Amino acid sequence: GSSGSSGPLPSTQNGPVFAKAIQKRVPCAYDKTALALEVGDIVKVTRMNINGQWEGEVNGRKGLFPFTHVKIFDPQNPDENESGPSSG
C-alpha cells in the first residue's frame, strides 16, 4: 500500500471559535504546551483538533486547553452593551 503525498486541506475560509475561560487553568511545572487561563479570559483558537485539545493563543501564550474548561458563547453580541462615543 505505497503511501505518498496527497495534498493539504482544501482552500476554505472559516471563522474562529471564541470561548471564555469559566475556570482557572494553569500549566503544570512540567507543562509548557499547556496554556494558562483565568476566569474571564477570551481564548482565540484557530486550529481545533477533533481529538479534543485545541490550539489557542492568549496573552502572548499559545497552548493546548481542555474544552471542558471553557464555554462556547457569542462574545460578538451588542446585547448588554451600550453604544456611544467615548462611553462605556
Side-chain angles (χ1 to χ4, degrees):
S2 73
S3 73
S5 299
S6 285
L9 281 273
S11 272
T12 60
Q13 270 278 112
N14 309 270
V17 170
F18 285 102
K20 179 150 79 152
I22 63 162
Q23 208 270 111
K24 185 158 76 273
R25 170 80 152 186
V26 296
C28 209
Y30 45 95
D31 205 342
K32 283 89 82 196
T33 53
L35 210 183
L37 307 157
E38 69 165 332
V39 181
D41 209 318
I42 310 302
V43 190
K44 181 208 159 163
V45 50
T46 72
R47 276 271 280 280
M48 282 171 134
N49 308 308
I50 303 158
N51 88 295
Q53 271 150 122
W54 313 326
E55 208 173 35
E57 202 270 85
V58 168
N59 294 309
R61 305 175 87 275
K62 45 177 163 70
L64 297 184
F65 59 96
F67 61 91
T68 43
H69 274 219
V70 306
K71 194 88 85 150
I72 299 281
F73 72 120
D74 208 31
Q76 60 171 44
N77 270 338
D79 209 330
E80 297 276 285
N81 206 307
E82 66 151 275
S83 69
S86 203
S87 57

